[PDB]
Symmetry: D2
């Protein structure tokens, strides 16, 4: 027998080898046992098992579950999958006779779909926990360094000075939206296929709504062919995982560049890096995060390509649904606490960041801006700024060092009050609308992040 | 600027589609400047006048991008100057930024675009629901592995293609909540130093909220990746429908006859539209894989790579805007050969399963239920009849529990009726299912409108 | 090292496959040191015997990674030091660098891997050729758009799946040429400062040449992306063959019967067969396209030189190979054991008056203008439908009534056998051509395995 | 044909680039018909002159597609008939077939396109070589993990981006041999029954050989996939160079200064070309992934899904045609800040490695060589000096093996000079490597021609 399908003789060596999934699907075991208990209650509530038969199966399953859990029951070298292994194990405990009675009204197709969903619902919550740990590490670094100012980058060129905290937090928001995506995903994942049978619906008079409720689902499927055939929930999980990986790679890239000798923004901790003197530390975790995001994009693209153009209903190609998702989850289970530890382990050189923030006359922008809100038109504000730069460049000073003689000599509009934005402190203070980098704003942002995170966590718990 | 740099950075051949939104953004900004007290009641009106002149000329086709123009914004500023002069039109340049503009404009576009895609998806759902409703009684082989398992209602099968599409609309609805956050007021990356109100501006421009972090608002493109994901998902779902139609339409199956206006071509008809749907779904997977690859490992904040956000998303939308009405029309146009499907539904003794499951229901242990069923096939093979054509004694000779009452499931009508739990193929369940699709579709439509 | 860092960087669960290659690189590095005069004859022989001992225990699986080993290389260093002491073992570390070693081992591994894949491909091609040779004269409908077009030889359809596979073998040959460049001697980035000879080392290790640039040699992975690509291409070609088989094996088509040992049947009907292998092929082609796309995404935008990201080059390529090593013999056995229902196929070949085309082509060949020829073919079809008859059963009086040009000579193409025989240019389905084609495939295959051997 | 079908099948907005090849095929076919004795000399020459005139009108823009033209082939049938009339026009339809012709045009177009890309690739390699030849002495930090490792010649780093591009050129050469097989004469699927010579036609059209199987020739698109891969591989190689340039030009590295004509812009210059290169490599990866997804699981022979082969490859080519001259120019325009690079090259006591390695060369066991270098660093860090400034006494204190001769590797120049095996950064090896790049590039160029 192979996947409950039958042979006059037996499968060829090469087919037996191709069919095997026990080296990755064993993590489905506990869910499979759960489903079996529920199917026992189904056959009972359908008057298909006596009280002792039901008790006989339930004790069989408990024993089996204990043995699976302690690692003393495993697959033989001949089981194609966890389902065949578990059937064999139950029959060992309860006899061909009683074990066989459980097989009645069972189909592999709705079973496999349901178990994958149950496992996914736990997996996205483990991933959610890792995401929250990274948001947490970012938010605690932001709270620990609420006044450091660094050059804000666009195209890796210095633009406006920003709070380091504001930059850190900018990495948390995509992570919060990924949690929001996990919440939205869970509602679609929470639909049970049990009762769908092979494709056409169960002919035992079972109740798909009750079984759903038994297993943690929020509802039962509306269409048995769809329930057994479709894998868009796996595709959606794969997308959310790739998205998380991509968001981590963006942070990973910052840390990598921040860590270079030339930037010197951060010093890596010895426990969270590898590796000329002790001054040479490699951001290996950040580099792995970068590389693994590629892999998770690949899992997603492969999964979609596997789903494409498949006719209804169940096909054996759908055996390929699990490994890419399992891989994505496993990588993120490794990556998320490594990245959270990395972020938390970081030491920032704020003197280095403060000396770079105003380089190449970036505050000229703040000058021009200041002038615009006096009432100077854009062209004149920007001519005056260019001039003040030229002046400071020829005099070899910073824009702030310019005397009032010179300020007035560039434009009568340039009151000495402009100096309040000609320092990095002052520049950053001016940016005080919602989302801006001013201290008052970033403090409220960090707070809103704590709330959204607790709100998202509570939405997942249900 | 070198010719090569200029050639590489021209975007007008795809971004012109953003022109209506830029004008709307320009109107809002005129208001921002006025409320900031940087425009007189008079200046404001001149600018608002000029933007309507530019708008009408844009919707006319009379104002167009010049080969000289780098992008849509350049063209429109030039076009504004040529309606209010360098003095006034230049006053608008005050307190504005490319980085937040571009993110905002794309989100506004996408929010219109997912609604057009939503409309097309609803068309395909209605087409499938209509064909299901028009075929209350047609029964077909239910396939796994392209092999006949249980008989199903054609309606049940068609509806199985409507449900993924409804989940896609549900995805669009969830996507729209994240898309509806405005970056306007973020400036280049650090936040505006005017005293504007991003909240007011968000409401003006049609968003539900303003962004919480100016760096994030200008650097992130995950809304674009999520859009690309939904489009790729819709296309993958259409490709499964496309594959069914292609196979059904083959000479050997003959389940459907294609309409001459919806095929090409003796009585040889090609399912061209379904073929294109299959092929295009790969292209949409590609757009998505490419876009995530583009976003990967970019440092903050804005980088010019993020300009590569627009084209794969534009392409996916444009493809679906063609594919959805064509698929909807292909589905509505099919003629199902109901007699052909009905004669195939019980072939290869598929009803042996229904016999085995009837026995299980009677109390018979699973292993002997199957032996009986296999034995029943054997008896019928020898005789060359079908299962229901077995005499009572023959039946009893296979098992005592095999009473004459088993015949209620040995026709395809009987088989299909026995599957009457939620989601099953029984006419009564399928009628409720069909009805619930309509209600689900109206609920999702109403959510997008709001 | 934190627990999270160590879990993240552990590769021994996949990289163990490089162990025998690492051992080979150690024997070669031993020689390098001896040739530079950094080892005595006795030390050299103690290291070589230490490595032989370790090769034995690796080969019998008695030596294995510890939970504590970062990767295969660390494990092998530990194992050697266990067998020759810290004293001697330490001497081998001299002049050693991880960056060039890792690139070299992966390339050595790939060169063996593509050769196992090529063998797998040659078996599928052999299974297709054997089936073609076994049915030299069976005719089937030719499909475009899953619609019956011109009749073709079954053999011509089967061989059509052999050609992309021969192109994939040709690509393995091209790939091998670029893969056979040794990075050994490039050090961490900048080149070795020992006086070692990279070209000597290359040859010890079975390479054809040594890298021209130390930074490129350590940092580049376009050789792994090319392998991944060739693997995806093979899987895509298999998937097209798989799709044919899936459709052919349906009830409605009934072109093939699946062999009992190569497909699952129904619980009740062991002989009502699902084409599981073909479906898994189709499904696995997605996975291999994803391996490729991911790997290229991994390589994208990496600054030079080496970065830890490049460690991610291995697993997608290992996965692709592993999948094909399972799939290729599955597919070969599946194709070799198919039963073709040649009678069903020949009854369907002239379905829907497909032979009307051959009639139109015949007229155009006599000088009849295109549009006239088709008007004539459509008339022959209507006459034939109206009279419940096949085109060839229209009498001379009826043919001549459609057109004076339609002489009884036209009947040479109103038979499927005659339709097939008229398509006799190179690449056509005529039996003479197909027989030559079948000969050339065998010679092309022999040519390609000779090329791999070198 | 319905509106939705018409809009979906319409290919003229991207297939127009195939017109010159379609006309070439039409000339070839006029000759086939002539050799089959279905054209008189005068009919042949009327068509050839018709085709020449149409070709000229196509080249100058005076003949274009109408909204009504399904595809390029239909637009050209229209235009031919306008020029030579319906009657001579219609003789050309005889014996021709869409499926073998579309595969042929695409191949012909690809083989020209890979040559244009190759020319772009040679330009970047040329720009890299020229910058390397212009810097025979500049030394920089060699990076791993973006951390300073061994000093390397700047030329050695620059040439490291040339080698992947030569391998891509080599991939193009290999690709071209497979692309160079003609499918013309395969008919729709089964072979032509016209008694034509496919080898003669192949020569006419510019191919090296004719297909061996009509079904494969008309169905298979692995040549498109292979081209897509080479293009994505070039884009990926460009993105690594782009990434280097983006990092080098940040204020913090200061390794290069950008040229005003090759960047956008206080005195802040953005490396836009480099950023666009990086973002477009994602797009090209996506084109490849999508195309392979389109090809996956397609039954033989021709299916309309295969029309989707073209746009991903056209896009890939178009993008590389803009990017390559822009990257070549960008590289040629850089100013390298050699003093900044030289000052960073020894930083963090990276020469400790060279010290240790020198000790190993002497005979010192690896672990001792290392503890010695660790000691030397400690000594110099306390004193605030470079390794080179440690006196003969303090060197002998650390180790008797550590004689004054060691100072030959404690300058960056000395460090770099010791790396003198093939492929190493020693000035004499790099000069040989540069010369070999010229030879390889010319050898490859020649393989591509004719």
């Amino acid at each position: 027998s192979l996947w409950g399908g039958r042979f006059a003789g037996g499968p060829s060596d090469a087919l037996a080898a191709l069919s095997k999934s026990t080296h990755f699907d064993w993590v489905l075991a506990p869910y499979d046992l759960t489903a079996s208990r529920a199917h026992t209650m189904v056959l009972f509530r359908a008057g298909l098992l006596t009280e002792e038969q039901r008790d006989g199966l339930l004790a069989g399953l408990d024993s089996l579950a204990q043995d699976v859990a302690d690692g003393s029951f495993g697959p033989l070298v001949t089981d194609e999958d966890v389902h065949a292994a578990l059937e064999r194990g139950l029959i060992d405990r309860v006899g061909p006779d009683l074990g066989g009675r459980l097989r009645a009204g069972r189909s592999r197709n709705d079973q496999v779909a349901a178990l994958f969903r149950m496992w996914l619902r736990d997996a996205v919550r483990r991933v959610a926990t890792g995401v929250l740990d990274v948001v947490g590490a970012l938010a605690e670094q932001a709270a620990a360094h609420p006044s450091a100012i660094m050059p804000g980058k666009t195209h890796l060129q210095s633009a406006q000075p920003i709070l380091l905290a504001h930059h850190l937090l900018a990495h948390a928001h995509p992570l919060l939206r990924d949690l929001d995506r996990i919440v939205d995903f869970d509602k679609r994942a929470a639909v049970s296929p049990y009762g769908s049978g092979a494709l056409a619906g169960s002919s035992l008079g079972l109740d798909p709504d009750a079984i759903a409720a038994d297993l943690g689902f929020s509802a039962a499927a509306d269409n048995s062919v769809d329930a057994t055939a479709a894998r868009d929930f796996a595709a959606e999980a794969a997308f959310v995982f790739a998205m998380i990986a991509v968001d981590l790679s963006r942070l990973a890239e910052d840390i990598i560049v921040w860590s270079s000798t030339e930037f010197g923004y951060v010093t890596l901790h010895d426990s969270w890096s590898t590796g000329i003197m002790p001054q040479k530390k490699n951001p290996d975790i950040a580099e792995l995060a970068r590389g693994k995001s590629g892999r998770l994009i690949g899992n997603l693209a492969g999964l979609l390509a596997t789903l494409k153009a498949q006719p209804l209903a169940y096909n054996r190609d759908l055996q390929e649904d699990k490994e890419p998702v399992f891989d994505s989850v496993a990588q993120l289970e490794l990556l998320l606490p490594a990245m959270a530890g990395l972020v938390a382990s970081l030491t920032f050189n704020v003197q280095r960041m403060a000396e770079l923030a105003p380089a190449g006359y970036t505050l000229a922008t703040d000058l021009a801006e200041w002038l615009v809100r006096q009432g100077v038109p854009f062209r004149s504000a920007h001519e005056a700024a260019g001039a003040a730069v030229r002046a400071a460049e020829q005099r070899g000073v910073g824009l702030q060092e310019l005397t009032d003689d010179e300020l007035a000599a560039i434009s009568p509009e340039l009151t000495p009050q402009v100096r309040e934005v000609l320092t990095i402190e002052g520049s950053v203070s001016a940016r005080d609308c919602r989302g801006g980098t001013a201290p008052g704003r970033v403090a409220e942002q960090l707070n809103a992040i704590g709330e959204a995170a607790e709100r998202l966590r509570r939405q997942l718990v249900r």
